Amino acid sequence: SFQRQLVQRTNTLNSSIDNATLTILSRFQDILDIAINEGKDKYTVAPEVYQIECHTVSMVRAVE
Amino acid sequence: DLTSIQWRMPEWVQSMGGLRTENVLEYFSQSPFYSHKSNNEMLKMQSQFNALDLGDLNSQLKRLTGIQFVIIHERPPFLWVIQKQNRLNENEVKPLTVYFVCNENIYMAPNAYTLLATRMLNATYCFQKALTKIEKFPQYNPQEGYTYPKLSNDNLEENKNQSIENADYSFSPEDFSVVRAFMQSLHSSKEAPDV
Amino acid sequence: SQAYKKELIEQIMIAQTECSLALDMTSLLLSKFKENSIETISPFLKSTVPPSSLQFSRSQPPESKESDATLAKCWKEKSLTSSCKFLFEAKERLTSVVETEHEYYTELVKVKEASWPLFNSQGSNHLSVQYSCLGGISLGLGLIRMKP
Amino acid sequence: DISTEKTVESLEAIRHRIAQIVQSLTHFLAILHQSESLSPWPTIHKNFNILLSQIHSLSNNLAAHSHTLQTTSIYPSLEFPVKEQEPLLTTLLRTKALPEVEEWEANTLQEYEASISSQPKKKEANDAYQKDQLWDQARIIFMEERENYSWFRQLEIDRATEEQNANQMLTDILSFMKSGKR
């Protein structure tokens, strides 16, 4: 039918939107979880850096 | 520094007629890893003085608490395991760092977490490098996808499927075609006489 | 060109090796009894010696240098600075992209204001004009090529 | 003795993580091999996300068990001849970091000590503790604040009822043309 086509399309649009926004906000939100420094093992710090950069790239990507 | 570093005195071991039981401990005495505080040291002093006042090893070691390097295991004529320990009681003892004869060589036993985290370090570092090399490279444009600017094109010859049906007459790139097939047909043909 | 993936292959490969050694030594470590990990090792290693070479050793944490704690700070601060520079740079290039953006669809407004048919193309993604709107016989289309 | 079981189990999980990440590496190279040109970006970024999921899963896997991992040490047992495997087992004993990595570490310490030169007796790690607490508060306020904001019409569904009565009305009018009945 003519209706459900535009409707489901709208569903796709809203889906992509909420997914992108939620992506950005999530990636930023977890950086604060990564933000902790003191008390960590020297090795444990290392992955977290790459995690920061990857979260940032994920943010800019969802922006795209 | 006192970890993975190698050490050896092959002329010594060759001089000994090969390691046996006490003499391999003497080889540990040869080692930089050897401690003056070790019960083996003061027992060595006891051999220098009391001499006769000695009883094998463990019967002499276990009753004399302190730093020790008991031979828990061995693999003649190659490996010889030597566990460090610290006696407290007739029963109680603290296990300590392994040292061993890695064929006329001595290496301290690595901690598991240190090397697992080491490899994790190496991997995550390769990941950081993996990200940094390609950052600032996907020249994005919403209109044109993830462009990668280049000196020249070929080389090799979302749901945006919508377009007018018949199209023709029309235009639509076809930015390039067959030009690769020119020269490649030429080289496939240059080998033709060879074929 | 290509050298990026060409080097990246070396990077991921070497990292995969560095990890594979862990996978193997640990598989040997847990194959001391269970068959679950002996299956996973490379035959080249299984060809050497039967596993369970490793054994427990309860000996100290042991200890850590204070400078490592300084590294924990130094890495993270640089990472955060990299984060801010990254976000700022991305805002810059995206601002330039918007500069490219406003120029175009406004032109499309200039044409649509003059009442012309408009249609999307293939993967080229540019909108295109049905220039033969007055018609005659055959259909006609034309992409509005960007000309920086 | 009992803790050895803790090791076998925690590493039962960690080896699984290693299987996951190495398998991801195999799949990743398997993707890059498919390309003759450069691989498309989105798949690549997706791959890095898979990576982050894995390494984060492993760091999480380290847990309190990591302390137990610290307690342990690596030595060959009686079961293992070193007749030819010695050169490779030494590689297995190699807890040493990649030389470029430690080189980078010296590159970090040299400049931190350079900061110490520019700032002799001005340690701030202690202040950085309460600042980390500031991250701890800022994150919580950041979480709670987002919920305050709005986040996402049956009448449009009712439009279908409009089409419905329009349809029955069509049945009515066709009945009319058929018969003139009203």
Swiss-Prot record, chain A:
It is found in: Nucleus. Component of the Mediator complex, a coactivator involved in the regulated transcription of nearly all RNA polymerase II-dependent genes. Mediator functions as a bridge to convey information from gene-specific regulatory proteins to the basal RNA polymerase II transcription machinery. Mediator is recruited to promoters by direct interactions with regulatory proteins and serves as a scaffold for the assembly of a functional preinitiation complex with RNA polymerase II and the general transcription factors. Belongs to the Mediator complex subunit 22 family. Component of the Mediator complex. This is Mediator of RNA polymerase II transcription subunit 22. The gene is med22. The chain holds residues 5 to 68 of 136 of the full protein.
Curated annotation (Swiss-Prot), chain B:
Signal peptide: none annotated. Keywords: Activator, Nucleus, Transcription, Transcription regulation. It comes from the Eukaryota. The keyword Phosphoprotein does not apply. One of its GO terms (molecular function) is transcription coactivator activity. It is found in: Nucleus. Its main location: nucleus. GO terms for cellular component: core mediator complex; mediator complex. GO terms for biological process: positive regulation of transcription initiation by RNA polymerase II; regulation of transcription by RNA polymerase II. Belongs to the Mediator complex subunit 6 family. Component of the Mediator complex. PANTHER family: MED-6-RELATED. This is Mediator of RNA polymerase II transcription subunit 6. It comes from Schizosaccharomyces pombe (strain 972 / ATCC 24843) (Fission yeast). The lineage of its organism: Eukaryota, Fungi, Dikarya, Ascomycota, Taphrinomycotina. The gene is med6.
Curated annotation (Swiss-Prot), chain C:
It is found in: Nucleus. Residues 49-62 have a biased composition (Polar residues). Residues 48-68 are annotated as: Disordered. Component of the Mediator complex, a coactivator involved in the regulated transcription of nearly all RNA polymerase II-dependent genes. Mediator functions as a bridge to convey information from gene-specific regulatory proteins to the basal RNA polymerase II transcription machinery. Mediator is recruited to promoters by direct interactions with regulatory proteins and serves as a scaffold for the assembly of a functional preinitiation complex with RNA polymerase II and the general transcription factors. Belongs to the Mediator complex subunit 17 family. Component of the Mediator complex. Interacts with med18, prk1 and rbp1. This is Mediator of RNA polymerase II transcription subunit 17. It comes from Schizosaccharomyces pombe (strain 972 / ATCC 24843). The gene is med17. The chain holds residues 101 to 248 of 545 of the full protein.
Swiss-Prot record, chain D:
It is found in: Nucleus. Disulfide bonds: none annotated. Pfam families: Med8. Its main location: nucleus. GO terms for cellular component: core mediator complex; mediator complex; nucleus. Keywords: Activator, Nucleus, Transcription, Transcription regulation. Component of the Mediator complex. Belongs to the Mediator complex subunit 8 family. This is Mediator of RNA polymerase II transcription subunit 8. It comes from Schizosaccharomyces pombe (strain 972 / ATCC 24843) (Fission yeast). The lineage of its organism: Eukaryota, Fungi, Dikarya, Ascomycota, Taphrinomycotina. The gene is med8.
